[PDB]
Design a protein around this ligand. Structure first.
Ligand code: J63
Ligand code: MG
Lengths: 555, 405
């Protein structure tokens, strides 16, 4: 029964570069013995071919003893040819997430081992795969070979393999749409909602269809039985999870303990609800030396104990049903940390996740919530191809007040209020117009660039004044300090006039928490207030009030 | 049937740009469309040997209930070789209609060395399939080289119509044909449809979009006309004039800030002295004159800033040097977006880009009052133009907001 040839993929080298010429290493006598037995065999199978003296290219080959197998194993060091081979559109640039799959009655694995070496290699490229087997005692010309199929460990072998496998599977998929197929590495995952009888026939239908191209399947009922272990996951007929997550419990935690606790709890946060890593990941910021031990803060150990109790029991996620709605629900956890669960039916998570605020001096709860939504939205387009409905801990009037007043454009898709505290709220809100009958504070500050000495104070329309002297301060601190004093010494309604474009920029950004010790005190003051109108005037134009207090603080 | 020798810029390689995720409805539409395009030879499937990629997505027109494929050829455009002195009369016109003559491109085939650079990918939901890859065989809608190559092959189609109408200006930009005539709409509509059966004689070619360059938003900067001035009014005024002094020369604010002498309540009324009103009037006269020595340099980038003014209002300024505005404007007619900020900003970006094509024949780079992550998540849902401009993001509230309204 004739087989079909698999169309070869024209490969070339990166333009400007030539093929590889690195030297062949000296091998032991037994290693040379083994490579001859393997390569003689592989030549019979058509996978490689002897070549003459013309081909000047050389890739080195080693021999690695297996752990308990007395069958040697060959290994070509293709690292040099990979630096020279062209770039491919790697069709594995994304792997599926278990939460997006559609529950299938039966799922079979098919292992495509020798399929890798069933795939031809472009004739004009085979010249670069050449390698020498050094002869006994270096007394003959080391026999020369070149590959005729996709070699193990070559840059383009995964791409060319999956594109050829895809080309072959498309007719099968078309002529029976009741079967879905996924391909990764050496494995085929094949499933359907068919009566388990019809399913196996269609498996056989696929296995014969594969031999149409001379491809060999595992005939046996294969040993891989649920759970499938795949890319760190555990997949069951009705649920998935991650391969077990158990924490190293130590007293001395090094720096290569923390960076790898980073990679794990992030990995675990996709299904384990409520994982936090702010204070813990905040430990790494400084040094790259890979041996240092650090004391955690009393907020990084108290956070890690809130982790372990999440991780005592196994947790599982549900598979996706396209006819029920998709829902995402966010909870604030404090310290710029947020968690979300994605589900379709209550208490049956498809997946979970966390969001940490980006690094910045000043921040805001509403902006963080908005940022988290965009992350979940993009994540949901990937996995499910649609945006979930959001349940957010923020009231419809808070959000309406925010986005209609905020200076940036901003938007959330379809969402509704969920009353699970702590709630996101607007802690203060500035006036649009000057307040009638409210005392008007003209503030100013100034510092001496040399001595770091400066003053900060105010003057009002009711004759009230203050000037305060400061040490080790800048112009920007005094301008903030002056506004702080006006907030301190005023009633529940106040008009502030300032010339600090810097101060106005911070406060018009509406922060509710800051890394600046001084900005936080101002926020705390604004919270106590009822109405605050902040007004700006240009400096050094002699604006009264501003001119008077500028002279008092520059003195 | 013969191709044109196309090549990139020296030292630059083709685009390797990640495809961003698409919704199910858009994946479905791109599949249906790209299948019909494949049967017609306009595009062919490719393999892994092609490492280049340019993003693709789908849009819906203003009223065309049928999707359209939009390829984001922005990266390939930056890397395609430079190949018409822009008609400065098109802006003085009274009515301009824009047509998508993009289908015309699909009849000229493309240089076969260059086709590998036009690679794009239809992605699958959750990566459960590998992406369907194609490369273009004909000229692609959106690529810079399409109108350049085709304009030799396009001048000939319309010169019988140009012979019949020397009044009518016709300008081509990307897949769009801007047609202008200074006459009533009844003549226009049939003249535009007459321009189609003249285009249908050879080869969504049916839609119409109507602009009016003469009656457009072009603005000055204005000071209020009040009878009783509070301290706050005069303070805001001195701020506006102080900012306008970076733009215009003879601006004075001394007699006006003289009134602010003292520490009065913000809501207290200050009668204006006469020196002050002399100063305010002379500044008012100055601001009606144009900005001095302000010119367009085609070698430089056009920059557009947009401010959100509230109540569906948006101000914008186009310029190349700071404080040298080539054009300013305001928008309050944002269509069907009364509760969506990002839809308004998206519609405003297109209107400003459209006005920029008419005036200068190229598109500006925007500075958008929005956070990177919010815009990049949503702008494709409301994008209806077949071209795409460049943009960056401003994260600090500019004080210029109420200077412009
Ligand atoms: C056929 C496949 C697309 C699929 C799988 C296979 C996965 C294996 C790991 C990589 C990603 C694909 N799974 C997971 O198997 C669970 C299972 C279901 C039924 C019987 C036995 C095992 C799915 O769950 N669905 O729905 C599925 O549809
Ligand atoms: Mg000062």
């Amino acid at each position: 029964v004739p087989i079909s040839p698999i169309e070869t993929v024209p490969v070339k080298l990166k333009p400007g570069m030539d093929g590889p010429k690195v030297k062949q290493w000296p091998l032991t006598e037994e290693k040379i013995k083994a490579l001859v037995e393997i390569c003689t065999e592989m030549e019979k199978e058509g996978k490689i071919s002897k070549i003459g003296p013309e081909n000047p290219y050389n890739t080195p080959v080693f021999a690695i003893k297996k752990k308990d197998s007395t069958k040697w194993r060959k290994l070509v060091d293709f690292r040099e040819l990979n630096k020279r081979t062209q770039d491919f559109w790697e069709v594995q640039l994304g792997i599926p997430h278990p939460a997006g799959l559609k529950k299938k009655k039966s799922v079979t694995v098919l292992d495509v081992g020798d399929a890798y070496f069933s795939v031809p290699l472009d004739e004009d490229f085979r010249k670069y795969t050449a390698f020498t087997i050094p002869s006994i005692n270096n007394e003959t010309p080391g026999i020369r070979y070149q590959y005729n199929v996709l070699p193990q460990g070559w840059k383009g072998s995964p791409a060319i393999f999956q594109s050829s496998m895809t080309k072959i599977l498309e007719p099968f998929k078309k002529q029976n749409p009741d079967i879905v197929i996924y391909q990764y590495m050496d494995d085929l995952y094949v499933g359907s909602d068919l009566e388990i009888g019809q399913h196996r026939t269609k498996i056989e239908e696929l296995r014969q269809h594969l031999l149409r191209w001379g491809l060999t399947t595992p005939d046996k009922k294969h040993q891989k039985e649920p759970p499938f272990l795949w890319m760190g996951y555990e997949l069951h007929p009705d649920k998935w999870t991650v391969q077990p997550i158990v924490l190293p419990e130590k007293d001395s935690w090094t720096v290569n303990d923390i960076q790898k606790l980073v990679g794990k709890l992030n990995w675990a946060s996709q299904i384990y609800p409520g994982i936090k890593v702010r204070q813990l990941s905040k430990l790494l910021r400084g040094t790259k030396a890979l041996t240092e031990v650090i004391p955690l803060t009393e907020e990084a150990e108290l956070e890690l104990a809130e982790n372990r109790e999440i991780l005592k029991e196994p947790v599982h996620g549900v598979y996706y049903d396209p006819s029920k709605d998709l829902i995402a629900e966010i909870q604030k956890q404090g310290q710029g940390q947020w968690t979300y669960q994605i589900y379709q039916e209550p208490f049956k998570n498809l997946k979970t996740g966390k969001y940490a605020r980006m690094r910045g001096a000043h921040t805001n709860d509403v902006k963080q919530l908005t940022e988290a939504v965009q992350k979940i939205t993009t994540e949901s387009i990937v996995i499910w191809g649609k945006t979930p409905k959001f349940k957010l801990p923020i009231q419809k009037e808070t959000w309406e007040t925010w986005w209609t007043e905020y200076w940036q454009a901003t938007w959330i898709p379809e969402w509704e209020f969920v009353n699970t505290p702590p709630l996101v709220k607007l802690w203060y809100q500035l006036e649009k117009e000057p307040i009638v009958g409210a005392e008007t504070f003209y503030v100013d500050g100034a510092a001496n660039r040399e001595t770091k000495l400066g003053k900060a104070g105010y003057v009002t329309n009711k004759g009230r004044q203050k000037v305060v002297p400061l040490t080790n301060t800048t112009n920007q601190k005094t301008e903030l300090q002056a506004i702080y004093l006006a907030l301190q010494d005023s009633g529940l309604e106040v008009n502030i006039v300032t010339d600090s474009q810097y101060a106005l920029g911070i406060i018009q950004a509406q922060p509710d928490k800051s890394e600046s010790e001084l900005v936080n005190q101002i926020i705390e003051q604004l919270i106590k207030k009822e109405k605050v109108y902040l007004a700006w005037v240009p400096a050094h134009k002699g604006i009264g009030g501003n001119e008077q207090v500028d002279k008092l603080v520059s003195a | 049937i013969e191709t044109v020798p196309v090549k990139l810029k020296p030292g630059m390689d083709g685009p390797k740009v990640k495809q961003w995720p698409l919704t199910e409805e858009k994946i479905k539409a791109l599949v249906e469309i790209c299948t019909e395009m494949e049967k017609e030879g306009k595009i062919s499937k490719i393999g892994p040997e092609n490492p280049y990629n340019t993003p693709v997505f789908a849009i819906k027109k203003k009223d065309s209930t049928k999707w359209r494929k939009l390829v984001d050829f922005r990266e390939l455009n930056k890397r395609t070789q430079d190949f018409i002195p822009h008609p400065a009369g098109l802006k003085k016109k009274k009515s301009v209609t824009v047509l998508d003559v993009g289908d015309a491109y699909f009849s000229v085939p493309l240089d076969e060395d260059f086709r590998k650079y036009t690679a794009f990918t239809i992605p699958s939901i959750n990566n459960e399939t590998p992406g369907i890859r194609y490369q273009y065989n004909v000229l692609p809608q959106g690529w810079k080289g399409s109108p350049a190559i085709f304009q030799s092959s396009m001048t000939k189609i319309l010169e019988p119509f140009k012979k019949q109408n020397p009044d009518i200006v016709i300008y081509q930009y990307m897949d769009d044909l801007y047609v202008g005539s200074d006459l009533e709409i009844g003549q226009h509509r049939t003249k535009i449809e007459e321009l189609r059966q003249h285009l249908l004689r050879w080869g969504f070619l049916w839609m119409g979009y109507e602009l009016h360059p003469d009656k457009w938003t072009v603005q000055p900067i204005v000071l209020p006309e009040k009878d009783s001035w509070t301290v706050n009014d005069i303070q805001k005024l001195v701020g506006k004039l102080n900012w306008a002094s970076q733009i215009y020369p003879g601006i004075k604010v001394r007699q006006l800030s003289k009134l602010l002498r003292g520490t009065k309540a913000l809501t207290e009324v200050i009668p204006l002295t006469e020196e002050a009103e002399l100063e305010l009037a002379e500044n008012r006269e100055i601001l009606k004159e144009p900005v001095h020595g302000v010119y367009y340099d085609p070698s430089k980038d056009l920059i557009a800033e947009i401010q959100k003014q509230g109540q569906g209002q948006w101000t914008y300024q186009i310029y190349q040097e700071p404080f040298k505005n080539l054009k300013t404007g305001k928008y309050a007619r944002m269509r069907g977006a009364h509760t969506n900020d990002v839809k308004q900003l998206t519609e405003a970006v297109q209107k400003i880009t459209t006005e920029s094509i008419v005036i200068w024949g190229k598109t500006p780079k925007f500075k958008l009052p929005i956070q990177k992550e919010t815009w990049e998540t949503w702008w494709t849902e409301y994008w209806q133009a077949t071209w795409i401009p460049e943009w960056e993001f401003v994260n600090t509230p500019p004080l210029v907001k109420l200077w412009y309204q």
